[model samples]
Target: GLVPRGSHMSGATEACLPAGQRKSGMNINFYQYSLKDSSTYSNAAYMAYGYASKTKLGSVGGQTDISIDYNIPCVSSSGTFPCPQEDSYGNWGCKGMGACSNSQGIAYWSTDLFGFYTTPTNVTLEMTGYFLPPQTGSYTFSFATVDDSAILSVGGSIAFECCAQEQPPITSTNFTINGIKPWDGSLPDNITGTVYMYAGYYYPLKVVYSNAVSWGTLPISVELPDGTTVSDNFEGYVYSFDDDLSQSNCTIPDPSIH
Candidate 1:
């Protein structure tokens, strides 16, 4: 919901209950900001999201990162995203307004929720998409979502999950998969995994982006099963547009993780 100074902005907040129930009215907003603007949204957003300036603004120079975190609204209380509602089919469905959009003709699902009470001890993530590594380590992470569920992937593996309010017997609102352990004070060895998430039964799933964080151990090395390794310090990985992946530009990825 935050935008840089001199940029036109748009945002909304809402609360949903049961099928069509409403806990509050739609709270759409538009605000202006500048580097010199005094509004909270205009100032640097790192501190508000519980991160220090040095941590959020790491020295990765290149294209300015313009990420977005659109969500499935299920507002019950503050700091929580909307949970899915039970529908005619007895499956859980996202509550609230706005719908999803799938830019690519592929299926995907995702939701957003805050206050997961997470730590390195009980978190794991996996992803499949496009990305490049910034360094050789497991950067620290501090993130939340806007709808029913959210997740994070490291080196193409599940690293974290949240917003687990499904209709059936509810599962833990997180992922603590086998082998992956909560990060200790170690380096964030380099990885080339996408931060993929999914939501909805729609084939060609909608792409619902969420606010994400990078937990740091700084530039750790990724050990592959075939005795190969990738590290953050080298020419950290980056993805080319699908059609441009030439043999020299794109080497085969680690089969185990892919």
Candidate 2:
């Protein structure tokens, strides 16, 4: 069984990594997606995080405009039913379609609001991020989420993906179809996928998550070849528009929330 751990680093210490610590994590941007209704709360139908192939320095937090662009893959390119491109049933079931973005400014970058539907339902949660590989090789990155949903891409490859459901493991180079299954509406989610990464560099990391109306939590960590884990408290950042992730947002005091 996995044990839960916590870090006691001060807010200042939590903001900037000392030096070597920077080598093992990713500087991330947590985007929150939704199909906002008239009344209230929404599901995290789509969201993302990654090393911006389209962004640059100081793109982490603060009041700056950043651009977001990324693509998703599907199993069947065939022109048939269950084919997203076919556009037959409810958007034709496009694979990982929580797809979106704009150019003018950072779409959703603020932590001053609270509760749930205070801000626009389609806002993005931007924060300082980082992700590091250990030993390098063909490795599987596993993730667990509650109520929320996400898609992970490492080194520009789809590591794992789904919307409000449970995803299967990526057994081969072709991840078009795997554990992309439905969830039982339970807790403690599980998803794993394989990718080849080097020890010295950071991959084009992209993780998209959409939080629901009430609760949301996503814990993504890696299992090394040596049977060790890279699930340290510093792997990535957790964000909410009303919370400053660059500050001590790396740790979640309330396990039930994100």
Candidate 3:
């Protein structure tokens, strides 16, 4: 028989977040491996995290060090088939363009814009990331939509959900930080992704951290294929980017058809 306690065991209703939380961030380092940089390495924990060895940081911690400890696992050493020309088929695939493959940027940074596309009939991509929040509480967030679809989650719960239903050129969306807390002093976990994409499409990805929460106290270093310089926002903490993140970063007028 189920225990009929007088109260609900679901959980407490988290208070509404103050504002501009995603603007806050940590110094966790996110690693990556994609069709963009295909290396035939075994998934032997090739990726490393937060100024530590791959075997050092353990998963499931509030202050998860943003580390890329795990390998893409299947680095296509055997020349796997179906280089993700479209969406994932649940078998024999690869993380190619136009998909969420750029989502992996999350582990290293707080927020990002990553996408890949083939244009026309086929479009696919994957994005995945985790939050090393500055503190425990709700946060404000928004998704910018241009084309295709997008989805997001925090603390293992879905925050923003979308798919390839809209057309090209996207603007961001606002989201709330329901639950996050300061790291309790443990090696942080990770976030990653995989996607199948197409050619003749625009595939651009970018992410930024507030540098306020902090997995560790140190300057973070990042190197991207695009030769873009990454900055740290972890020092700012909450009160920043709120007014804008929930709005539009594109600086253009919002266009919508009633």
Candidate 4:
């Protein structure tokens, strides 16, 4: 019988973050889909969810961009910010209500919806990524947007949605389908919900937003279990792994899927 050598692998362990420095931001992929003025929220939802499950951007028709961002608590208000030129199809350039402004004003310009492209009359943003909590406990999440519709999902369950007709849940073997409430404009600006999570686990997160007319904005906030609030500095917390983490092993499901 041959005895296996006890030598450790060289490069294998280097890819992982140090145990003390595990905190990191999620990786985000933004998908922009074109819509007609006559399009409804239902249509935008269909396109957003369809493109999200495919595991790749540009697999369908739309523009896609990648970015890294912190978990800023809110995205309220509008301000003058750097705007992109209009798309070739005649979508309006980011301006006025269409500007990609956030609560941080021009300092956080890149975080805005139009931060990637010009404001279009009919447009939808399908943002997908992973959220890594700093602790294990129940956390409450809230989301709000201006002049349009938006929905937020964490751990694969719908946490909040507003100003849209109820549509069928986006199904997957990954997470349970719950909290399918569709809100009208009558609802308050902040729609909140809670999810229990284990510290160090990566939860799949998604935000689907549609702007049928002119303006677009989405402000999100998270309340930790200990009553502490984490708004920004998501650079080390969110991740863009191809597949969600397997809680049992704390490892990504399938590195090759995405």
- lDDT per residue for candidate 2 within 146-238, as digits (tens), equals 223445554322332211001222222333112221344333456777654445343333444344332234455666766676552433322
Model 2 deviation from the true structure expressed as Cα RMSD, one decimal place:
18.1
Ranking by lDDT: 4, 2, 3, 1
Q: Estimate each model's TM-score.
A: 0.21, 0.39, 0.20, 0.50
Candidates' lDDT values, in order? 0.21, 0.33, 0.22, 0.41
**Which one is best on TM-score?**
4
Ranking 3 against 4 by TM-score, winner? 4
Where does candidate 3 stray beyond 4 Å? 1-8, 12-122, 157-258
- In model 2, where is the ten-residue run with the lowest total lDDT? 10-19
Model 3, poorest ten-residue lDDT window? 249-258
Query: Model 2 TM-score?
Result: 0.39
Question: Which 10 residues in a row give candidate 1 its minimum summed lDDT?
Answer: 199-208
Better of 1 and 4 by TM-score: 4
- lDDT measured at residue 156 in model 2 versus the true structure, 0 to 100: 20
Residue 36 of model 3 has an lDDT of: 22
Please tell me which predicted candidate would have the highest lDDT against the true structure: 4
The parts of candidate 1 lying over 4 Å away from their true place are: 1-66, 69-129, 156-239, 243-258
Write the residue-wise lDDT of candidate 1 on 1-258 in tens digits. Answer: 263332123111110111212111111111111121112221212112212212211111121111222222332334334333231111222344233221111212231111222221111111212223333222232122111112222321121111111111112222221111112321122223222211110000011111222111112233333335544322323211212212241222221121
Answer with 1 or 2, whichever has the higher lDDT: 2
